[PDB]
C-alpha cells in the first residue's frame, strides 16, 4: 500500500462542541442558467459562436443548494482549545450523481462572524472537504457518518493552499472525543491561522494529524496532492463518477473568472459511491484571530437537456434549462434564445 506518514501521537482526540443554530444563517443563493454560473463546460465537445443544445449532468435552475460553513472552536482569548462544527457529521447525503460547490462568492464582502453574531469581519474564502463512502454506518457512540469502509476522502492541506485526496479504510481509535473513544461528539479537522496559516509557512501535516487523531488510515490505495492555486475570487469545484474513473473538475485550474468546469484530476476509483459528507473542517483560533468564513454550497448534478450559447472566446456565457419554465422549454425549441411571440402548446 502507500504510507500515510506518521500516525497521531495523541490517544485522546480534541473535545468537540456542536452549535448548529449559530451555523444556520439566512441568505439567497439561487443558480441562474442565463448567468451560466454552475453550468459545466463539456471537455468532449468544443463549439464556435453558433448556439447548440446538448445533454449533460447539470444542476436544475432555481436550486438554492445546501449551505455549508466552518467556524472557529470556542476559545479563551489566551488559548483556543474547543473545536466547532455543525452537525454535518451525522448528516449523510447520497452521492447519486456527484455535486458542484461554489466558493469565494461570500469573500470580498463584510459579514458577521459565524461563532459570534456581534463580531463582524471581512469574509475569507474557504475550501470544502468531502469524504465519500459506498456504505455509512452509525458509530458505537451513536454518531452517524462513521462509515469506516468509506474510500474517497478529499481534504484541503496547508490551509487550502493545496488539495489532498486519498482512499483508505478508516480505523476507529480509543480516546476522549474519538469516535470509538470516550466522550465522542463529532469528528473535525483543525487549522491554526497563527502558526499553520502564517504567511510563508503552511503545514499540510497539521490538517492530516487532526484527521489521523479521529481515524487511523489503513489499506491506503493511493496518495494525491494538487497545488492548484489560491485566490479570493469565485471558484466552482465539481466531482462526478464515471465508469472509466472518478472525474474531478475545477474552474480555478483553467479560467477562475469564467466559472466553466474543466477536468483537472482523474481518480482511479471503480467502486460505486452511495454517500458523501461535507464541511467537517473546523478552525482553531483565538477570539482576535476569528474572522467571517466563506461557505461551500452543494448543487446536485442530474441528466438535463440544456440550450448552450458559446461566445467568440468559446466559453459558454448564456445557458437555458429546458426542464424548468414553459418559456424556457419554448426557447429550447427553434434552437433560439429569443423566440417570436406566438401561442404555443406545452406538456
Amino acid at each position, epitope marked *: 500500500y502507500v504510507d500515510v506518514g506518521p500516525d497521531s501521537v*495523541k490517544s485522546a482526540c480534541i*473535545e468537540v462542541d456542536i452549535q448548529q443554530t449559530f451555523f444556520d444563517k439566512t441568505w439567497p443563493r439561487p443558480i441562474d442558467v442565463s448567468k451560466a454560473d454552475g453550468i459545466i463546460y463539456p471537455q468532449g465537445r468544443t463549439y464556435s459562436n453558433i448556439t447548440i443544445t446538448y445533454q449533460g449532468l447539470f444542476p436544475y435552475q432555481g436550486d438554492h443548494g445546501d449551505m455549508y460553513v466552518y467556524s472557529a472552536g470556542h476559545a479563551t482569548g489566551t488559548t483556543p*482549545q474547543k473545536l466547532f462544527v455543525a452537525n454535518y457529521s451525522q448528516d449523510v447525503k447520497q452521492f447519486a450523481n456527484g455535486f458542484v460547490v461554489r466558493i469565494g462568492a461570500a469573500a470580498n464582502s463584510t459579514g458577521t462572524v459565524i461563532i459570534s453574531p456581534s463580531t463582524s469581519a471581512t469574509i475569507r474564502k474557504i475550501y470544502p472537504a468531502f469524504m465519500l463512502g459506498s456504505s455509512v454506518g452509525n458509530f458505537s457512540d451513536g454518531k452517524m457518518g462513521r462509515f469506516f469502509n468509506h474510500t474517497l476522502v478529499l481534504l484541503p492541506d496547508g490551509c487550502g493552499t493545496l488539495l489532498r485526496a486519498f482512499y483508505c479504510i478508516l480505523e476507529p481509535r*480509543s480516546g476522549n472525543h474519538c469516535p*470509538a*473513544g470516550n*466522550s465522542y461528539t463529532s469528528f473535525a479537522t483543525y487549522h491554526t491561522p497563527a*502558526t499553520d496559516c502564517s504567511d510563508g509557512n503552511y503545514n499540510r501535516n497539521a490538517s492530516l494529524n487532526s484527521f489521523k487523531e479521529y481515524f487511523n488510515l489503513r489499506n491506503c490505495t493511493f496518495m494525491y496532492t494538487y497545488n492548484i492555486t489560491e485566490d479570493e475570487i469565485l471558484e466552482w469545484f465539481g466531482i462526478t463518477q464515471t465508469a472509466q474513473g472518478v472525474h474531478l473538475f475545477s474552474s480555478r485550474y483553467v479560467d477562475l473568472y469564467g466559472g466553466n468546469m474543466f477536468q483537472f484530476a482523474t481518480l482511479p476509483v471503480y467502486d460505486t459511491i452511495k454517500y458523501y459528507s461535507i464541511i467537517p473542517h473546523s478552525i*482553531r483560533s483565538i477570539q482576535s484571530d476569528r474572522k467571517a468564513w466563506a461557505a461551500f454550497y452543494v448543487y446536485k448534478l442530474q441528466p438535463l437537456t440544456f440550450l448552450l450559447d458559446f461566445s467568440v472566446d468559446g466559453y459558454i456565457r448564456r445557458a437555458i434549462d429546458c426542464g424548468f419554465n414553459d418559456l424556457s422549454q419554448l426557447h429550447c425549441s427553434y434552437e433560439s434564445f429569443d423566440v417570436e411571440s406566438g401561442v404555443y402548446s406545452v406538456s
Partner: antibody
Amino acid sequence: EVQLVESGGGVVQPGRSLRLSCAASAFTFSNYGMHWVRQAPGKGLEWVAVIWSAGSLKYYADSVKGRFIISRDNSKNTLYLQMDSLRPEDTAVYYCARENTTYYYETSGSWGASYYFDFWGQGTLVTVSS
Amino acid sequence: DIQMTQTPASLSASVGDRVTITCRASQNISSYLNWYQQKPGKAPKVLIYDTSRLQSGVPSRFSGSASGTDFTLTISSLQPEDFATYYCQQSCTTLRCWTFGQGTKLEIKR
C-alpha cells in the same frame, strides 16, 4: 451537583462472582468516560478498569484479565462491573470516577487546563470472606 | 511497564516548614506526571495534572516541579491540615494501565 452512588458491594465467598453498580446523578455519563480505581488497605489507589462512553473498547489491568467486565448503559445511567474468582488479597475499596484528558495547544504559548476530575466516587469496601 | 518509587516514603515536617517530596518517573517518553493529595478515609483530590496548572482550592505554596527523571513536590507554610498522603502517577497515552502511588503521609515534628 454530580453525585456518584455505588451498590452491590458486600462480603462474598472466594471464587464467587459479584456485581458492582455505579449510578451517576445529574451527570453526563453518556458523553463522559468512567475510570475505576481500587484502594487496598495500607496501599495507594491503583486503576483497575476503564469503560469508554461509547463502550466499544474496555481496558483492564494486567493483573486482572477477563476477571473484570465493565458495561456502560447510557439510558440506565448505571455502570456495571463484574468481578469473578475473587480472593482475600483482591479485597479492596472500589471507586468509580470520571477523568477528562488534559490537552494544551501552544499556538502562541497557549495552555488549556482541560480538567474535569471533580466529584470523585465515594467507593464501596468489598471483603472476600466466609 | 511503569515502575514508580517515592524516595522519602514518610516525611517528618513541623508547622511552617519547607519540605520537598521527590518521586521518580519511569520513562521520559510520556510528559504527563500528576500529583494527588489524599485524606485518609476520603477519595484523593487532584493537585496537578500537566504540571502547568494549579487546582482551585489548592494554595500557591504547594507546587510541582520536574527535573530530569525525578519530579519533586515543594510545600511551604505547612499546617496539620496540610499534611496528607500523596500519590504521584505517570499518565501515558500509549499505556492504558495507570501507575500506582506508594503514598507519602507527613508526620509532625514535636
